[PDB]
Structure formats: structure tokens, C-alpha cells
From Swiss-Prot:
Residue span, Protein kinase domain: 6-258
GO cellular component, one term: cytoplasm
Entry keywords, A to Z: Apoptosis, ATP-binding, Cell cycle, Cell membrane, Cytoplasm, Host-virus interaction, Kinase, Magnesium, Membrane, Metal-binding, Nucleotide-binding, Nucleus, Phosphoprotein, Proto-oncogene, Serine/threonine-protein kinase, Transferase, Ubl conjugation
Protein name: Serine/threonine-protein kinase pim-1
Source organism of the structure: Homo sapiens (Human)
Free-text tissue specificity from the UniProt record: Expressed primarily in cells of the hematopoietic and germline lineages. Isoform 1 and isoform 2 are both expressed in prostate cancer cell lines.
A biological-process GO annotation: protein phosphorylation
GO molecular function list: ATP binding; manganese ion binding; protein serine kinase activity; protein serine/threonine kinase activator activity; protein serine/threonine kinase activity; ribosomal small subunit binding; transcription factor binding
Family according to the record: Belongs to the protein kinase superfamily. CAMK Ser/Thr protein kinase family. PIM subfamily.
Amino acid sequence: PLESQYQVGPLLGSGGFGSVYSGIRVSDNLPVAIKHVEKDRISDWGELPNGTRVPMEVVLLKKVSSGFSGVIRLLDWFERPDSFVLILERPEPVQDLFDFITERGALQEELARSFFWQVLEAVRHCHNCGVLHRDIKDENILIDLNRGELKLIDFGSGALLKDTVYTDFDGTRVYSPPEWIRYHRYHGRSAAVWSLGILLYDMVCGDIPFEHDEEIIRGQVFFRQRVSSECQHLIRWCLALRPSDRPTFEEIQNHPWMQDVLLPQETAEIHLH
Ligand SMILES: Cc1[nH]nc2cnc(-c3cccnc3)cc12
């Protein structure tokens, strides 16, 4: 009986994903986030192990939730007559990467290196668990300001990871690869790398590199900020027009720009406190 198990607070945000509120677990005052999603608005349905009809989002969240704190964990969920309700963990204090970039402008490379690495680790974690996120971007990353740790949120556009083609996509267009725009087909990992290339550019330039389909399709990267050559190179690499020309996760993290990352705690002490 959820209404009495959590104390609902202010609304945090709403959109295609639905509506998300601040809340507190009544038992221990654990800070939580309470997400509501309308059944009619749910395009993708999944099967629970015990065989149940449920939003794919819940399926993916269960698969990725455990010790690794690179992803935001699903604590519980409930079915309502016309909606599902998800209880998710909530860091406090917290701020999303989009708001942070808007606040702070372009980020220092040292800090961008830490953040990007943390994301890479998290995305690698989902892939390890058979989950593909499909909407990696600043708005879908949270920053625990005290610990300097980044957390992935919003698995509402995700899918089970597979090695065959995807012919559906419903994440953010300006973050989608050339081959989606052109052919409406992509492969999971190589698409994810492209979006990672967008995200990295966004961290270091304070903005997204492409706005229209034709810019995406052309794939020429102009840098509007001072950015090291290594970083430019890594970014150009992730944004290769041919998917098979993109680096693997291992190649990204072995890149020279990616060397000597700060620990999250260091990161907070230096860049966050
Ligand atoms: C502020 C916050 N803490 N824990 C969260 C989990 N999820 C979300 C979220 C935001 C947008 C869409 N879906 C989930 C937001 C969250």
C-alpha cells in the first residue's frame, strides 16, 4: 500500500518519460524518487521471470540493479489501474549533468575525463547485464555532488541487448547516429558509442555538436572551444560515419586522453566542493 509507505514530495520533472516526484521511505527516511508512467503511453512491454506483463523499463531496471552504483537502482514497483509506479533511489544533494553544464558552462578536461569514464563504466555495466540504454545524454545522468559519482537514469527507451539490427528508436534524435537517420537501422553498441561521442563533445564544448539531420549525416565536427588534440581525436573517433569505424569500449578507455582518471572522491574534492 504505497501511499502510506512513502511520503510524497515536490515534482522533480515530467515529459515523455512520465512524472517523477521526490519522496522519502517512511520506514527509514531513505530519500527516493517516485516515477509514474501511464499504461496507455507504454509502447514496450516485457515479461517478468515469473511471467508477468510489465513495462520493459521495469525489466531492464531489475536486470541492472545490484552492487554497482553506476546506475540508479529500482527499489520497488507497483501496478495501478492505469499506471505503473517505480520507487528509485535518490541521491541528495544531486544535480543532473544537463543542469551542471548549463550552470558551469564547458567543463575542464580533467573533470570531463572523470565524468566520461564513470559513464563508460556504467554503460559497460548495463551491456554486461544484457541491457541497452538507447538514450545516453546529459539529462539522463545524475551527479551525486558529495561523492563525485555519476548515475545513469531513465531506462524508458531501452531494450534487451542483441547482436542483430534495431529497426525502432525512441530516444533523442540529435543523439542518434547517421545510419538511423538514413536507414532506420542500427546496431546497439556502435550506436551507443556514437551517442557517447555526442556526450563527450557536449561536456567539453558546453553544447551539442549537431542540430539537424544533414549535419548528423555529414558528420563534420567543428570545435567551438579550446579542446586538446587527444580529446578532439577521441571525439572524432566515436563519431565516425561508418559504425564499423567507431572504437570499442576497450579502445575508448585505452585511448591516451583517457589516461590517469581521477577517483570520484578526488573529483568532488577538487571540482565539486
Ligand atoms: C532526481 C532522481 N533521483 N533518482 C531518480 C531516478 N530517476 C529519475 C528519472 C528522471 C527522468 C526520467 N526517469 C527517471 C530521476 C531521479
